[PDB]
Amino acid sequence: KETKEVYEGEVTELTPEDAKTISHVIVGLKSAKGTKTLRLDPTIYESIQREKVSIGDV
Amino acid sequence: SQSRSAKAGLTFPVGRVHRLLRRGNYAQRIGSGAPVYLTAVLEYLAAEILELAGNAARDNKKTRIIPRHLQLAIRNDDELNKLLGNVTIAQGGVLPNIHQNLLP
Amino acid sequence: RKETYSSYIYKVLKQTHPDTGISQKSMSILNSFVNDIFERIATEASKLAAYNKKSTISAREIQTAVRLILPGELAKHAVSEGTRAVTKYSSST
Amino acid sequence: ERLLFLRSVGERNEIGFPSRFKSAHYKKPTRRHKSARQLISDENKRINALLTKANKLVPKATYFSVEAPPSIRPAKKYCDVTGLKGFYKSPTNNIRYHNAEIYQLIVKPMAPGVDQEYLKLRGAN
Amino acid sequence: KAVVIDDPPLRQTPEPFDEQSAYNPQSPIAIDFGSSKLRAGFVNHATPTHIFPNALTKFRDRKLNKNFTFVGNDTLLDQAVRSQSRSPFDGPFVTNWNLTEEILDYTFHHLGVVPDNGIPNPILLTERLATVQSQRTNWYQILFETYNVPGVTFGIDSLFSFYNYNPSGNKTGLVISCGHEDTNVIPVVDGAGILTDAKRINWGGHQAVDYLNDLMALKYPYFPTKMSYLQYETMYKDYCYVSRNYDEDIEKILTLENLDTNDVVVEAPFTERVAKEEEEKKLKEQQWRETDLNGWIKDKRLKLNKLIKRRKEKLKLRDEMKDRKSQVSQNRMKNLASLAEDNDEDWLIYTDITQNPEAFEEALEYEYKDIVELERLLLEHYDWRNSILHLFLRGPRPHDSENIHEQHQMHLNVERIRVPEVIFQPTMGGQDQAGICELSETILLKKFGSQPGKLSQTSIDMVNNVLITGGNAKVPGLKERIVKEFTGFLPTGTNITVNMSSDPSLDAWKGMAALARNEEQYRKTVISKKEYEEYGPEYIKEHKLGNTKYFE
């Protein structure tokens, strides 16, 4: 038995902070029913930076 | 610094036509858009004539521009002939035209 | 310093037909043609300036004179290119 | 009857120089017209004069701080003729059109002096 | 069936006036000096007793040689006196104050006031947000000199309507007002308008009707009848609505099934051997048509199709010859120079290279006659639904150019939603400003100590009390669109309440009446004669319902 949890939408804020190692990344997501902000892991930030994700992408 | 022709993106001069407009006593006051408008019009007209002349010179399979090609370009084109229906040409010749009944 | 338009029409010929040369009689044809067009357009603009009690020649009078002199397709292309050049020159910021 | 009913209304609305609904001191002044374009001019010239006096302070609520700033998102492009979505823009007169038949029937054969008030609606002339 | 528009019908009964017996010289009097309408009436009533347009005519009689004066509803009596009405306003400001003085005298006469050395009642007046110093200087001058008023207060009509719908005077909310000449967004904290964060868009009802008039003038350049401002105002009032989603409605606004229900048509008001061989061929053709009509009809249809294909190829050749940059013109120039640079066949080629402008027309007429004969032989034995332009002008029906009634018709298909969209996208009207939703977003999400992502308590209280006012809020679909945008940019689960009255053009006067009925907070806003004589016309009374000072 497993569960699936998905966040998707348009990026409205991508602000990382360090200490040269990033501590955590705040990402803001937006959809048609509203918006929601998240805290994120540095490894997921590396995965975001791999995909060339900027402000305004889905 | 730099000239006004590159400021307006042209190759023809702007101060030269401003000077020629100035003491040409057309009027005692001349605005700033007057030489750039005249410069752009002269640009387009010279470019169109040079396009048709180069096409006629290539059409002759001969690598220079001879006034026979200028005559061919002037009279083959419709409204260039309308603009230049008054001026006689130097060393140009006459376009070949035979009326239909003279052919037997 | 006898003044003529030789270099400028040499380059605008050179941006479209690189391996082509001009004869000197032809060189004189383009020089006289440019001077004749300049004289016709400028005297029509001066006549239209004297039309309206106006002591200044601006771009609007020359646009009206270009629309008066040229045939129609040449006229609309000339005012299009001249308007683009004027808007290029005016927004020098 | 139409030429008399207006007179009958006009006599029911007498306003005189010694006005009942007015103070004793009229002292009817004379002013220049002062249209709406130069009211902005003398207002910001007065504001600039006060600010340059203060520099040799900070505004709070003037007519020009109330003005809305330009937007930060890109603006939508629409066809100038039909008002639909504008895919293409003509290179001669900078008119945005929808498709081919709009271009061939309107944008190409248009009279010269009609594109300017097509561009005046969005303020692009 | 196309509906017929015209001028609005004229008023019959003249404007009456209140009795002078009920007047008392101590009650205040409220005046809403609007750019489009004037609203005046005494404080003790709930609704104003005098509503009329802000207009004035200097009527001239040819017979009596007397200058008359018709104000407001009395200008709605003749067509000539309606068409020559003049407003004291010029844009968002007032230019000529003689018209305003005459209009104020008219409305003082109609209120049944018996004065003595000026008006004894204090007045309540509205003013524009961040008004020019000259305007308040002139207002102070004309009031305190020509009318001897004891007390004056100034305020914005948006804050008056907010006070009308929140009479406690200390609530927190957001005000959106769509006026005649501008649209404002004002945030309110604890009942006091925060005027350092208010914003204004230069667009109103007047610009919208002018936009519709310009669009109709550009759409139908050969319209034979001239339309007035009032007719375009009726078309703007009747058949304009705000779309739920403008970004996708324009993709399906010109389909055929959508145009069946969402198209409005508006009608302007107005008041021997060769002969024997030919006869034998005709007899043989008649015998073949009587013998085998199907085969003869098929052969005639094939001949007509071949003639049509030949005509299409000839028209394509004629169009291709007209292009100077085409390859056909280059081949013509190559052949012409080939006859000008270096036999009977070459002679025939030179004869065949001649210009045929009228010969092509004669050959096209002959081919049209041959196609007509082929169609007649087929009888004996270009769709407008694919044209976006035809759907744009003449809708989903075929068009008759010869019909006199169809020559005065006017269709409204894209302009029903294009006109009200300018308050959300001001760039379409020519103003380089942000829209309503953008300004509301940058107010709620980045001000009053609200970082983007979490809302402060002030922002939550602002969202929970959004009020829409103004005369231009009569457009349907506005509230649902604002609610959809607001829940678009806000965090999920945020409660959104949007309030709009039944008539959003009379809430300002009810705000004046509610402030004047509340005696305690009245006296913070009144300006006495001694106050104006002491601190001069350069004086701003800071209160919770009016303007503030220009600096800090």
From Swiss-Prot, chain A:
Signal peptide region:
none
The subcellular location is:
Nucleus
Q: What else is known?
A: Present with 11600 molecules/cell in log phase SD medium.
Q: How does it assemble?
A: Probably forms a homohexamer. Interacts with RVB2 and may form heterododecamers with RVB2. Component of the SWR1 chromatin remodeling complex composed of at least ACT1, ARP4, RVB1, RVB2, ARP6, YAF9, VPS71, VPS72, SWC3, SWC4, SWC5, SWC7 and SWR1, and perhaps BDF1. Component of the chromatin-remodeling INO80 complex, at least composed of ARP4, ARP5, ARP8, RVB1, RVB2, TAF14, NHP10, IES1, IES3, IES4, IES6, ACT1, IES2, IES5 and INO80. Component of the R2TP complex composed of at least RVB1, RVB2, TAH1 and PIH1. Interacts with SPT15/TBP and HSP90.
Instruction: Give the function comment from the record.
Output: DNA helicase which participates in several chromatin remodeling complexes, including the SWR1 and the INO80 complexes. The SWR1 complex mediates the ATP-dependent exchange of histone H2A for the H2A variant HZT1 leading to transcriptional regulation of selected genes by chromatin remodeling. The INO80 complex remodels chromatin by shifting nucleosomes. Its ability to induce transcription of some phosphate-responsive genes is modulated by inositol polyphosphates. The INO80 complex is involved in DNA repair by associating to 'Ser-129' phosphorylated H2A histones as a response to DNA damage.
Provide the family line: Belongs to the RuvB family.
Its gene name is RVB1
From Swiss-Prot, chain C:
Q: What is its main location?
A: nucleus
Has keyword rRNA processing? no
* Keyword annotations of the record: Acetylation, Chromosome, DNA-binding, Isopeptide bond, Methylation, Nucleosome core, Nucleus, Phosphoprotein, Ubl conjugation
Impact upon substituting residue 88 to R: Impairs ubiquitin conjugation, DNA double-strand brakes formation during meiosis and histone H3-K79 methylation
Which superkingdom heads the taxonomic lineage of this protein's source?
A: Eukaryota
What Gene Ontology terms describe what this protein does at the molecular function level? DNA binding; protein heterodimerization activity; structural constituent of chromatin
The covalent link annotated as Glycyl lysine isopeptide (Lys-Gly) (interchain with G-Cter in ubiquitin) occurs at 88
N6-succinyllysine PTM positions read 11
Q: How is it modified after translation?
A: Monoubiquitinated by the RAD6/UBC2-BRE1 complex to form H2BK123ub1. H2BK123ub1 gives a specific tag for epigenetic transcriptional activation and is also prerequisite for H3K4me and H3K79me formation. H2BK123ub1 also modulates the formation of double-strand breaks during meiosis and is a prerequisite for DNA-damage checkpoint activation. Deubiquitination is performed by UBP8 in presence of SGF11.
Effect on the protein of changing residue 12 to F: Confers UV-radiation sensitivity
Its annotated compartments are: Nucleus; Chromosome
Quaternary data: The nucleosome is a histone octamer containing two molecules each of H2A, H2B, H3 and H4 assembled in one H3-H4 heterotetramer and two H2A-H2B heterodimers. The octamer wraps approximately 147 bp of DNA.
Q: Which family does it belong to?
A: Belongs to the histone H2B family.
The protein depicted here goes by the name: Histone H2B.1
Q: Which organism is it from?
A: Saccharomyces cerevisiae (strain ATCC 204508 / S288c)
Gene name, Swiss-Prot/TrEMBL: HTB1
Curated annotation (Swiss-Prot), chain D:
Oligomeric form and interacting partners: Component of the chromatin-remodeling INO80 complex, at least composed of ARP4, ARP5, ARP8, RVB1, RVB2, TAF14, NHP10, IES1, IES3, IES4, IES6, ACT1, IES2, IES5 and INO80.
Which keywords does this Swiss-Prot/TrEMBL entry list?
Answer: Nucleus, Transcription, Transcription regulation
Any one of the GO BP annotations:
chromatin remodeling
Additional remarks: Present with 1720 molecules/cell in log phase SD medium.
* Full-length numbering of the shown residues: 28 to 162 of 166
Q: Belongs to which family?
A: Belongs to the IES6 family.
Taken from the UniProt entry, a GO cellular component term is: Ino80 complex
Q: Which organism is it from?
A: Saccharomyces cerevisiae (strain ATCC 204508 / S288c)
Please state where this protein is localized: Nucleus
What superkingdom does the record give? Answer: Eukaryota
Q: What is this protein called?
A: Chromatin-remodeling complex subunit IES6
Biological function:
Probably involved in transcription regulation via its interaction with the INO80 complex, a chromatin remodeling complex. Also involved in the regulation of telomere length.
Tell me yes or no: is Glycoprotein among this UniProt entry's keywords: no
Curated annotation (Swiss-Prot), chain E:
Question: InterPro entries, from UniProt?
Answer: Actin, ATPase_NBD
Report keywords, A-Z. Answer: Isopeptide bond, Nucleus, Phosphoprotein, Transcription, Transcription regulation, Ubl conjugation
What cellular component terms from Gene Ontology apply here? cytoplasm; Ino80 complex; nucleus
Q: Does the keyword Phosphoprotein apply?
A: yes
SMART domains attached to this UniProt entry: ACTIN
Q: What's the main place this protein lives?
A: nucleus
Q: Name one GO molecular function term.
A: enzyme regulator activity
* Superkingdom, natural source: Eukaryota
- Kindly list any coiled-coil regions of this protein: none
Q: Where in the cell is it found?
A: Nucleus
Give residues for the crosslink Glycyl lysine isopeptide (Lys-Gly) (interchain with G-Cter in ubiquitin).
1
Modification sites for Phosphothreonine: 13
Is the Phosphoprotein keyword given for this protein?
Answer: yes
* Pfam families documented for this protein: Actin
Name a biological process GO annotation. chromatin remodeling
How does this chain assemble?
A: Component of the chromatin-remodeling INO80 complex, at least composed of ARP4, ARP5, ARP8, RVB1, RVB2, TAF14, NHP10, IES1, IES3, IES4, IES6, ACT1, IES2, IES5 and INO80.
The record's similarity note reads: Belongs to the actin family.
**Additional record remark:** Present with 2170 molecules/cell in log phase SD medium.
> What is this protein for, i.e. what is its function?
Probably involved in transcription regulation via its interaction with the INO80 complex, a chromatin remodeling complex.
The entry's protein name is Actin-related protein 5
